[PDB]
Design a protein around this ligand. Structure first.
Ligand code: CLA
Ligand code: CLA
Ligand code: CLA
Ligand code: CLA
Ligand code: CLA
Ligand code: CLA
Ligand code: CLA
Ligand code: CLA
Ligand SMILES: CC(=O)O[C@H]1CC(C)(C)C(=C=C/C(C)=C/C=C/C(C)=C/C=C/C=C(C)/C=C/C=C(\C)C(=O)C[C@@]23O[C@]2(C)C[C@@H](O)CC3(C)C)[C@](C)(O)C1
Ligand SMILES: CC1=C(C#C/C(C)=C/C=C/C(C)=C/C=C/C=C(C)/C=C/C=C(C)/C=C/[C@@]23O[C@]2(C)C[C@@H](O)CC3(C)C)C(C)(C)C[C@H](O)C1
Lengths: 167, 166, 63, 92, 188, 156, 91
């Protein structure tokens, strides 16, 4: 309806309180423009990557390392790991998951499967049993996704700027 | 019939008093060519930009600095503060903030051109002054008059400062 | 269409397809192609006449 | 070596002979077409095709000198290009 | 389709003789020796008189701006300049060759935007369908046309005559700039 | 819209001065408008010619030159460009009000009535004086320029 | 794709294409299409000029960003045709 976070206009058509984190924030009609399931999957994927990125950046800068590491600050750790080699192995490992994700996205958007975006059915302890748990955890996940996007953007920009300690 | 501002000149077709501040002043007739909602949003935006710009110019010229701006090493005459600030890279922050707000501005003008019924320049940022519709209309006409004054005020201020080259 | 009339042939396989001919005779019942159109442009065989049905002819000028 | 590229320095090589031939060939074709238009209305067009009516053939040949204006006039009046809905066509 | 006779193009200059019968700068009939206006009857491939009038007015307007630019530029009048740009060049043929691309790059691409944004239904004009488009009526300053039919026709006729004259002038100076000696007595 | 119902006839004799009969050949209101504008421009022009030749000052000016040859040098200096801009704006306003009117219907614009009347000094005799002074200014400025361009100068 | 599973995209009886031809962008408005097309044209022509016209290309100077941005010029053409199609379809 008349959107939240832009109280002088209405949220685009897809935003109708259907999905988690729907604060009615899409002023440009950029999700009524193109399918919002793809948009939500992209949002979730960005958020997960940035959660992992922030926590890994902080750990490496604090001093967390592997049995054989270059033992370098997390800024130059990209170049060090690439020159060592295992970063390309990480590329292959994530490429396997990304090709399976190509498949999953195709079925989800075509309609062969009733898959929610960013839902790989990874629930070992059944932490989302009842629907109330499902929406609560999806809401928390999306809020953390957005906040971690911002967090890693700030961390990496600041590190590339000053080249200082952890903060 | 005949224009309020130009009783010798005929009234423009689109200008009919619906928009506040209308006196039928349009010899060139650009209103009939461009949509009008875009035009009045542009008028509000130009007015607000120049209103804030005059205040910023005078306060920067008088001697007021922002927190930490003393190290921006400007000539303190504003006249150079533009070159100094783009060289220091802080005007890119202003550009980013303005683009962040102008995404919403583009969305809002698209909405009112589409049919959302948002009046041009409305952004729901009111300081609790939309209580009465008559007061809101009076304030809107105040804003449009102050805009029409402030555009030319900034023009005169910057042109005189440039002729001085101080 | 009418005897002594100029008619454009509309049969696709005719040598005179989309061309004019003078009607000389229209027969009664019987013939599936009652009209007898006479041309002046001999086909490959040499004949300048052929029988057509009313639907395969369109008048251009009347007698 | 004749330079046929359209430069006016070497116009006499092709451009002026080209215009001369185009005028002459138009004269020829217009004389032929106009005589055919005359003969088709004759009582015996088939015999007129062989035996040329020379008195009017000379007239058509002479009158074809102004073919570009005559052809343009026939074009505008629509008496040059028969509508295709009136030309024999083989079953596609 | 609307015929040529209803268009504001008649010129008294052609029908200026004993028995011409022209008045107010307009001849009783339009001029068309090679009947190009009426060529659409032969085939639809050709443009209609609507397209032809649109092209005529476009050529006239462009040629008038062009000849005015030629005259002013060759007269020595030039704009202010900076270290980046110098507008001092009398030769009107190579004047655009010598100014920064933003300069001519903003002349072009904005001429290109306008010619293309104003052009809506020009193919309907080609097919002679002026349902919602008058040829030459881009909407630029149409308010200044007199409401009287006579005055409006007079004004449009003045426009057409000036456009044709300027087309002749600009092409004369062009065809004596290239192929020298075409237009005798030309200043440029 | 006719010459008969207009101010500016011969004063004493009262007849209309149109020997060549040019009133009927063009819109009479346009004739009146252009006559008034020409008279006003020539009034200003002869006054300015006299002042600049006198050496009457010009607030904030730099160069001193005779009015006969001042045109080229002020064009070079750049003041005449600004004068052209101001005149162009004013005459574009007059374009907008008058042109949509030639050979047409002057709605009510009274040829020559620019509404520039703050002091309330309008009157019929003053309009007649305006027209007569404008015409004599035209002829006088013609004499001024023709005589100045041929040497003879000063009070002429 | 088979003969059956294929959209009815023929439009010879109508004045403009159906929006379905645009595929994934069958719902993005004409405003977005036009603005993106204009930005794409400007950016791509800038990249091409900076790569081969303002500078001389070479093994040591070929720039990947300019090369990629060059491909926004045909994308700009497609986007502007799309803008016209959506304007005519009413979106
Ligand atoms: C690339 C990351 C990303 C993606 C794919 C999405 C996707 C989405 N968000 Mg968004 N969002 C993000 C980051 C992202 N978000 C971040 C970091 C925040 C700030 C905390 C938000 C805050 C937010 C809110 C509050 C809401 C959404 C919602 C949405 C939906 C519609 C908005 C839209 O235009 O789609 C995404 C389009 C884009 C991201 C456009 C690209 C960005 C521009 C061009 C970059 C320029 C700016 C910057 C300086 C760089 C959609 C599922 C709404 C929702 O849940 O609807 C169901 C909603 O209520 N988002
Ligand atoms: C959402 C999380 C987040 C947080 C907690 C911070 C926090 C900080 N940022 Mg920011 N930053 C963020 C997001 C964030 N940033 C993002 C999304 C960007 C990318 C646009 C940046 C880009 C950025 C830059 C470029 C810089 C900072 C800097 C800083 C530090 C000082 C700035 C200051 O005091 O400003 C006044 C309050 C501060 C610790 C500054 C720094 O380097 O500090 C050492 C600095 O120069 N940040
Ligand atoms: C709100 C608090 C705040 C804070 C913590 C800072 C902090 C800073 N500003 Mg300042 N600044 C502020 C508000 C603030 N600014 C505002 C509101 C503006 C907008 C006018 C500016 C505009 C500004 C400019 C133009 C510049 C700074 C600069 C700086 C840096 C050095 C000055 C300093 O340390 O001052 C003590 C605190 C520092 C990162 C300078 C800088 O980063 O130089 C490299 C600089 O040139 N600031
Ligand atoms: C000339 C002064 C002036 C006036 C009379 C108004 C009047 C208005 N503005 Mg505001 N506005 C101004 C300057 C002004 N504005 C400037 C400079 C900006 C740029 C930041 C804005 C940006 C702006 C936006 C974006 C919006 C408004 C809105 C409003 C309305 C509600 C707030 C109000 O009554 O403020 C009156 C203000 C004062 C009495 C104090 C002004 C002086 C300060 C203290 C300095 C009202 C029509 C909102 C609206 O349209 O509501 C429907 C809205 O969305 N204004
Ligand atoms: C009456 C004169 C006449 C006219 C107006 C045309 C017209 C045409 N012929 Mg040609 N044609 C003619 C006679 C004529 N033909 C004759 C007699 C023959 C048999 C040899 C041909 C065999 C022929 C072929 C095989 C082809 C054409 C083609 C064409 C077309 C292209 C022009 C060209 O390349 O000509 C080519 C000209 C010739 C091959 C030789 C022409 C013979 C002489 C020189 C001219 C006849 C004049 C005649 C005696 C005049 C009598 C009038 C007098 C009594 C007053 C055009 C429709 C071509 C086509 O279809 O293009 C679309 C094509 O493929 N024609
Ligand atoms: C290229 C621009 C151009 C386009 C038109 C179009 C038109 N003119 Mg023409 N006109 C032009 C130039 C042009 N004119 C010039 C330069 C003059 C000489 C002053 C005239 C003088 C003129 C008159 C006096 C009249 C017209 C009229 C017309 C209309 C009917 C003729 C026609 O079908 O023209 C089609 C035009 C072309 C195909 C272009 C000509 C191309 C050939 C090959 C000549 C090449 C140039 C040269 C010979 C070298 C039409 C709207 C009549 C009208 O509007 O009546 C209502 C009318 O009365 N025109
Ligand atoms: C009617 C038209 C007209 C024209 C074409 C000019 C032209 C000129 N006048 Mg002006 N002048 C005018 C009216 C006119 N004047 C009038 C009405 C007066 C009487 C008050 C004057 C009194 C006057 C003086 C006293 C002087 C000029 C001068 C000038 C020069 C430019 C002034 C300038 O830039 O002003 C701003 C725009 C130029 C030769 C100056 C000159 O040529 O100095 C050498 C100069 O000194 N003029
Ligand atoms: C000039 C006349 C013309 C007019 C049209 C009209 C149309 N075409 Mg197009 N088309 C044309 C020429 C034309 N076409 C030509 C010459 C080709 C052959 C290449 C095509 C190939 C083509 C295809 C394959 C398709 C269309 C489709 C369409 C429709 C949608 C257009 C649109 O909005 O695209 C919108 C375009 C965009 C939003 C941007 C994408 C376009 C750019 C150019 C892609 C560039 C990719 C990049 C360079 C890849 C790497 C290159 C290389 C290394 C491999 C519409 C009916 C589409 C449809 O669905 O029709 C049923 C469709 O699928 N056209
Ligand atoms: C923008 C907006 O909102 O509203 C605007 C838009 C709108 C409506 C368009 C408006 C307008 C009208 C406009 C702008 C009109 C502009 C008209 C213009 C610019 C008209 C030039 C004619 C030149 C000719 C005929 C030249 C002949 C030239 C000839 C015949 C020559 O002999 C040239 C010559 O070189 C030769 C060949 C030989 C040489 O020896 C030298 C000479 C010099 C002798 C308004 C009213 O302003 C309002
Ligand atoms: C007709 C017409 C128009 C027009 C026009 C045009 C072209 C107008 C041009 C006007 C122009 C160019 C007007 C200059 C004035 C200069 C002045 C006043 C200088 C005084 C200077 C004085 C009094 C100097 C005095 C001194 O030397 C004294 C005496 C002795 C010294 O001790 C002191 C000094 C040095 C100070 C309109 C209105 C634009 C539109 C309408 O549609 C038609």
């Amino acid at each position: 309806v008349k959107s939240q976070a832009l109280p002088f206009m209405d949220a685009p058509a897809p935003l109708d309180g259907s999905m988690a984190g729907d604060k009615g924030f899409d002023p440009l009609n950029l999700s009524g423009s193109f399918d919002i399931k793809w948009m939500r999957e992209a949002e979730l994927k960005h958020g997960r990557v940035c959660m992992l990125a922030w926590v890994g950046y902080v750990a490496v800068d604090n001093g967390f390392y592997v049995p054989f590491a270059p033992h370098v600050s997390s800024l130059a750790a990209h170049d060090a790991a690439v020159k060592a080699g295992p970063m390309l192995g990480l590329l292959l490992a994530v490429g396997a998951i990304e090709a399976i994700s190509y498949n999953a996205i195709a079925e989800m958007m075509s309609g062969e499967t009733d898959r929610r975006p960013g839902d790989f059915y990874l629930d070992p302890f059944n932490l989302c049993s009842t629907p109330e748990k499902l929406e609560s955890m999806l809401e928390k996940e999306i809020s953390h996704c957005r906040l971690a996007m911002f967090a890693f953007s700030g961390v990496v920009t600041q590190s590339a700027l000053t080249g200082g300690a952890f903060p | 019939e005949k224009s309020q501002a130009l009783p010798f000149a005929e009234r423009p077709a689109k200008l009919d008093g619906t928009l506040v501040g209308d006196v039928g002043f349009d010899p060139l007739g650009l209103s009939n060519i461009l949509p009008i909602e875009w035009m009045r949003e542009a008028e509000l935006k130009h007015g607000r930009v120049c209103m804030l710009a005059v205040v910023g110019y005078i306060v920067v010229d008088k001697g007021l600095r922002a927190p930490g701006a003393e190290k921006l090493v400007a000539a303190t005459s504003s006249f150079t503060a533009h070159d100094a600030a783009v060289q220091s890279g802080h005007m890119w922050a202003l550009l980013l903030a303005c683009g962040l707000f102008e995404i919403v501005g583009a969305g809002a003008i698209a909405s009112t051109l589409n049919g959302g019924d948002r009046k041009p320049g409305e952004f729901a940022l009111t300081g609790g002054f939309d209580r009465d519709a008559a007061k809101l209309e009076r304030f809107k006409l105040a804003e449009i008059k102050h805009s029409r004054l402030a555009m030319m005020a900034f023009s005169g201020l910057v042109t005189q400062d440039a002729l001085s080259h101080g | 269409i009418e005897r002594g009339s100029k008619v454009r042939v509309l049969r696709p396989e005719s040598y005179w397809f989309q061309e004019c001919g003078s009607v000389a005779t229209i027969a009664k019942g019987g013939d599936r192609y009652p009209v007898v159109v006479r041309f002046e442009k001999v086909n490959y065989a040499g004949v300048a006449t052929n029988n057509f049905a009313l639907d395969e002819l369109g008048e251009v000028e009347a007698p | 070596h004749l330079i046929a590229d359209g430069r006016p320095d070497h116009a006499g090589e092709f451009v002026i002979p080209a215009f001369g031939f185009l005028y002459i060939a138009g004269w020829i074709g217009w004389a032929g077409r106009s005589y055919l238009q005359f003969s088709k209305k004759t009582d015996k067009p088939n015999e007129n095709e062989i035996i040329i009516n020379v008195p009017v053939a000379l007239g058509m040949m002479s009158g074809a000198f102004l073919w570009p204006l005559a052809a343009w006039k026939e074009l505008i009046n629509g008496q040059l290009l028969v509508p295709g809905d009136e030309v024999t066509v083989s079953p596609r | 389709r609307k015929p040529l006779s209803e268009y504001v193009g008649a010129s008294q200059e052609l029908a200026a003789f004993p028995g011409g019968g022209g008045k107010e700068g307009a001849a009783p009939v339009p001029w068309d020796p090679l009947q190009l206006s009426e060529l659409w009857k032969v085939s639809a491939n050709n443009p209609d008189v609507a397209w032809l009038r649109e092209a005529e007015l476009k050529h006239g307007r462009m040629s008038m701006l062009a000849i005015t630019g030629v005259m002013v530029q060759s007269a020595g009048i030039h704009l202010p300049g900076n270290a980046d740009i110098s507008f001092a060049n009398a030769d009107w043929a190579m004047a655009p060759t010598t100014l920064p691309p933003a300069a001519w790059g903003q002349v072009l691409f904005f001429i290109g935007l306008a010619e293309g944004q104003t052009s809506a239904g020009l193919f309907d004009l080609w097919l002679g369908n002026t349902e919602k488009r008058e040829p030459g009526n881009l909407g630029w300053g149409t308010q200044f046309l007199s409401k009287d039919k006579k005055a409006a026709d007079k004004m449009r006729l003045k426009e057409l005559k000036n456009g044709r004259l300027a087309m002749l002038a600009i092409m004369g100076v062009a065809f004596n700039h290239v192929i020298p000696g075409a237009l005798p007595g030309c200043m440029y | 819209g006719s010459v008969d119902s207009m101010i500016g006839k011969y004063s004493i004799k009262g007849t209309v001065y149109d020997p060549l009969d040019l009133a009927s050949k063009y819109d009479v209101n346009w004739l009146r408008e252009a006559e008034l504008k020409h008279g006003r421009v020539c009034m200003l022009a002869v006054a300015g010619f006299l002042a600049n030749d006198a050496g009457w000052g010009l607030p904030g000016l730099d160069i001193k030159c005779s009015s006969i040859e001042a045109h080229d040098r002020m064009v070079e200096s750049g003041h005449m460009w600004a004068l052209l801009a101001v005149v162009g704006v004013c005459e574009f306003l007059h374009f907008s009000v008058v042109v949509p009117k030639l050979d047409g219907d002057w709605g009510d614009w009274e040829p020559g009535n620019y509404g520039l009347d703050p002091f309330k000094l309008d009157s019929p005799s003053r309009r007649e004086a305006e027209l007569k002074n404008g015409r004599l200014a035209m002829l006088a400025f013609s004499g001024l320029v023709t005589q100045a361009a041929l040497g003879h100068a000063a009070p002429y | 794709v088979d003969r059956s599973e294929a959209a009815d995209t023929w439009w010879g009886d109508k004045d403009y294409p159906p929006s379905i031809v645009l595929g994934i962008g069958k719902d993005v408005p004409s405003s977005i299409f036009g603005v993106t097309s204009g930005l794409a044209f400007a950016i791509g022509v800038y990249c091409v000029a900076q790569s081969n016209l303002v500078n001389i290309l070479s093994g040591s100077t070929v720039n990947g960003f300019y090369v990629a941005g060059a491909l926004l010029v045909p994308y700009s053409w497609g986007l502007h045709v799309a803008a016209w199609i959506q304007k005519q379809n009413g979106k």
